[PDB]
């Protein structure tokens, strides 16, 4: 696990001692007091339970049942009972007529066509209820938590009854983003990007396939006939337009409609009056190598993984300078220390715009990396 420092806790005269620590996923934090067993706090998941479906964008349409009405030039306008149906999309162009095709006089003759709209494959857009976000702490005792329920209590053998006043800070600000779900894959897309899409959408209450003409276009009419240009599945345009977006793994253990993702947690533990212990970490200046090179997450942050074989118990100095050492590289990773030797430690970094230089190391054996960022 991971030990705490001195100022990570405070023991008072009467009452108890409080620990304010931030816990990201799959990173433990231990609480050790002499003549008492060590603690192990593990944040299992930070997930959502059954998000609400806002709309349903169609991206693979099947058009059938094409019917036409033909009116000769200057004899009125053609009408069809399918223009009012919610199943069909209709278009109104004109077909040149004359003595050949049997119409009275020349000119552009009216013609109306309609085609049945049957959406086969459709991606859905979910919106999160920010207060109902689940996050689980497995301190073994199992504890579940909500953004509403920031405090849940549990007594342990050795520390008395403990109350954990917690708080969750998100990572993508669901107040402006959606959760797009394709056939099997999922994504986190912007709300306005999903609403400025040129694809038909089904409403929340069920409604109808509003704005069907984004997928239905007919060939120019001949004398009295139409051919329907079946614009195929624009999945080739969507999965390409969804290349630079953050993914969300569906689920592994819990249930269906239980979407997991990473984030940030802040907790405060209410332990009894105990004389706790502090542990300090030095800096990592030894040889180290990249396990996974710094890659994008989608929301601006770059995530890098490193291995420290020599002098493990330390935090890694990550510097992102404008090269010099002066850095404007705002750091996201908390407790960037190594658990054991030959291990991997995650490092999440938020570089600024333009071109920066990642700096990992001091003096000898510096792991440098460049990362162009043109986020808009």
């Amino acid at each position, epitope marked *: 696990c991971i030990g705490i420092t001195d100022r990570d806790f405070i023991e008072g005269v009467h009452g108890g001692t409080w620990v304010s620590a931030t816990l990201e996923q799959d990173k433990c934090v231990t609480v050790m007091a002499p003549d008492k067993p060590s603690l192990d706090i593990s944040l299992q998941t930070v997930a959502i339970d059954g998000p609400a479906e806002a709309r349903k964008v169609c991206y693979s349409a099947v058009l*059938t049942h094409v019917k036409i009405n033909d009116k000769c030039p200057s004899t009125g306008e053609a009408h069809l009972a399918e223009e009012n149906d919610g199943d069909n999309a209709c278009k109104r162009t004109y077909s040149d007529r004359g003595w050949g095709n049997g119409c009275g006089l020349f000119g552009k003759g009216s013609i109306v066509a309609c085609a049945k709209f049957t959406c086969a494959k459709s991606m859905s857009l979910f919106e999160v209820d920010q207060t109902k976000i689940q996050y689980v702490i497995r301190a073994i005792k199992t504890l579940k938590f909500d953004a509403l329920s920031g405090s849940q209590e549990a007594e342990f053998t050795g520390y008395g009854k403990a109350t954990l006043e917690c708080q969750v800070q998100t990572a993508v600000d669901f107040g402006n983003s959606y959760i797009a779900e394709m056939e099997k894959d999922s994504w986190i897309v912007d709300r306005q990007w999903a609403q400025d899409l040129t694809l038909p959408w089904q409403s929340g209450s069920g409604g109808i396939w509003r704005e069907m003409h984004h997928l239905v276009e007919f060939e120019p009419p001949h004398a009295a006939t139409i*051919r329907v240009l079946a614009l195929g599945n624009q999945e080739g345009s969507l999965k390409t337009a969804l290349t630079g977006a953050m993914r969300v793994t569906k689920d592994e253990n819990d249930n269906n409609l239980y979407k997991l993702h990473g984030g940030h947690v802040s907790c405060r533990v209410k332990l009894s009056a105990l004389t706790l212990k502090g542990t300090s970490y030095k800096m990592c200046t030894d040889k180290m190598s990249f396990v996974k090179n710094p890659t994008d997450t989608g929301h601006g942050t770059v995530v890098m993984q490193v291995k420290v074989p020599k002098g493990a118990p330390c935090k890694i100095p990550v510097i992102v300078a404008d090269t010099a050492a002066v850095n404007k590289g705002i750091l996201v990773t908390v407790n960037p220390i190594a658990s054991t030797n030959d291990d991997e430690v995650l490092i999440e970094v938020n570089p600024p715009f333009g071109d920066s230089y990642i700096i990992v190391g001091t003096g000898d054996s510096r792991l440098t990396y460049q990362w162009h960022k043109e986020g808009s």
Partner: antibody
Amino acid sequence: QVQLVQSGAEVKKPGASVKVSCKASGYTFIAYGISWVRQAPGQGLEWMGWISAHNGNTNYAQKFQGRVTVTTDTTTRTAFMELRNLRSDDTAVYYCARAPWEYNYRSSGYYDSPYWGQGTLVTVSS
Amino acid sequence: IVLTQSPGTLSLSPGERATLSCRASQSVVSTYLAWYQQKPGQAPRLLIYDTSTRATGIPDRFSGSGSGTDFTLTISRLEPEDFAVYYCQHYDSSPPWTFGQGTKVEIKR
């Protein structure tokens, strides 16, 4: 309403020719090509040939390829069928039926109700 | 493209439930199957176009269905009028109309 009007009774000796009319009325005849079906007495139905009005290309059954010839008359609003040299089993009742015009899974009326005309009682015997 | 209509001769008393099968070669999005009713001495009266949408004036009890290669014409309550020969026609992306081989529904005793 919408209906197809066919020709009257015809009697021809074997080897002669028969031309059956089918006057469409009530819809846009420029689309909706007219197909032909027959019925031998007792025997079931079988499709002989097919024609269109727009894109006048036609198609015929393989068994009746060398005999039948289907023509159209756009101004007169009529669909024809000429039957060549007549055998004995060719005695039947011949129907003309409304049908789509291109048969390409969506053009115009690929999913529309096919109307049928009256009977054309062709009795061939010496 | 072959068709298979079963059963051939049906013996059902009035009031019972009928079920015909026009087993087609391949059922795809472009598959048209018009059902028919032929009384001896009359032209066929169009029953259902496409696969399940009733024709003009056809009573409510007549209804079609499609599942796999086999299609089904279902009559809920048979009536003395509804005893005749029933047919099915098939055409898909090609001119030719393939017709059924007949299904006569007679009174049982």
